[PDB]
A paper describes a structure:
Maternal embryonic leucine zipper kinase (MELK), which is also known as murine protein serine/threonine kinase 38 (MPK38) and pEg3 kinase, is a member of the AMP-activated protein kinase (AMPK)-related kinase family. MELK is a cell cycle-dependent protein kinase that is involved in the regulation of various biological processes, including cell proliferation, spliceosome assembly, hematopoiesis, stem cell self-renewal and apoptosis.,,,, and comprises an N-terminal Ser/Thr kinase domain and an adjacent ubiquitin-associated (UBA) domain. However, MELK is unique among these AMPK-related kinases in that it is not activated by LKB1 but undergoes autophosphorylation at the key Thr (Thr167 in human MELK) and additional Ser/Thr residues in the kinase, UBA and TP-rich domains.
All of these kinase-dead mutants were subjected to crystallization trials, and fortunately, the K40R/D150A double mutant yielded crystals with one molecule per asymmetric unit. The structure was determined by molecular replacement and refined to 2.75 Å resolution. This human MELK KD-UBA structure contains residues 2–335, which fold into a kinase domain followed by a noncanonical UBA domain. Notably, the UBA domain of MELK (MELK-UBA) binds to the back of the kinase domain on the opposite face of the catalytic cleft, which is similar to that observed in MARKs but distinct from that in AMPK. Binding of the UBA domain to the kinase domain of MELK results in a buried surface area of more than 1600 Å2, which is significantly larger than that in MARK2 (approximately 1200 Å2). Notably, although the activation segment between and including the DFG and APE motifs is disordered in most inactive kinase structures, this segment (residues 150–178) in our unphosphorylated MELK structure is traceable. The activation segments in the inactive MARK structures are folded into the catalytic cleft between the N- and C-lobes, which hinder the binding of an ATP molecule; in contrast, the activation segment in our unphosphorylated MELK KD-UBA protrudes from the cleft, which allows ATP⋅Mg2+ to bind, and the ordered Gly-rich loop might stabilize the bound ATP. In the structure of the CagA-bound MARK2, the active conformation was induced by the presence of the CagA peptide, which mimics the binding of a typical substrate to the P+1 loop in the kinase domain; however, the P+1 loop in our MELK KD-UBA structure distinctly protrudes, which would obstruct substrate binding. In our MELK structure, three residues of the R-spine in MELK are in perfect configuration as observed in the active MARK2-CagA structure; however, Phe151 adopts a distinct conformation due to the mutation of the preceding Asp150 to Ala. One disulfide bond is intramolecular and formed between Cys154 and Cys168, and the other is intermolecular and formed between two Cys169 residues from symmetry-related molecules.
Author numbering: 2 to 335
Write the structure that this text describes.
Amino acid sequence: KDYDELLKYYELHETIGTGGFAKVKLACHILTGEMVAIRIMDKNTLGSDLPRIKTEIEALKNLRHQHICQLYHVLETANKIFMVLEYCPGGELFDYIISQDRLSEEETRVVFRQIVSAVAYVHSQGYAHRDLKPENLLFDEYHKLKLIAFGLCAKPKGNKDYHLQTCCGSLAYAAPELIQGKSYLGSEADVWSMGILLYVLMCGFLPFDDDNVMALYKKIMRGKYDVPKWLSPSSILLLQQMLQVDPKKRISMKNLLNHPWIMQDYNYPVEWQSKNPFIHLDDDCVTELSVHHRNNRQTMEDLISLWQYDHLTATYLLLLAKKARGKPVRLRLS
């Protein structure tokens, strides 16, 4: 059984999403009693995608940001790969919307600034997302966005350095050239997707939408959309600057960060740099672990620092999160 190794660190809970690429189960990390989400993949099912899944994980390991969903633990079995991630109760973007017909300009600005923060960080690390959509946008118990920075939807193709949108669900949020599989400079692809998001937040429907798939396909490639009466000029403008069929004509991140629409109620640009980066080990978390590991501090630190996203790394991070909730930094041992 592949689960035996996992089952000694976690007890399972009712599944959250069947989804395409991975089953996702809600779970309890035994040592800390904290909730986590676990992504379960089947290596035999994934087959040829497995190499890419591994590089996507390597990418995720290098992301530590206030609006990126945190990775805790990666466990590999003969047949399975388990990803353990921060759990986000608020649910997906529209689980968090509360089904309200649409958000006001200031209501969307609050959310949208967080999306910009997350994506800017990702780009700063030298990656593009290439699959920004509502189900990749979760909300934690504080109603802060946590982006899922991991996916198999957008994939590289060809001898050239091109990317292709693979998930037909993602279509309405995907840039034209990405859909065509002629996307290089994928970061521009991301600016397009946020434009779509921006539109939906303020309007309560998509700018390009059709039951027919070719029809929807064509509307996107053509780039024309309705502009509701209730959108402000500023809103409308920012939309135009993002929703450009020509990738080269889409607003740059740099100009997005400090856009007048973006700065309008805040008078400071999006703060996209990691506010919680890994500088030094938190002493309390270390003392707690060494109590449990029955060892000395330096030894304990050196061990955490290997930072293998093993059960140790997960335990460290969950204790860390506990301190941040203002909870006791304690383990469940005994």
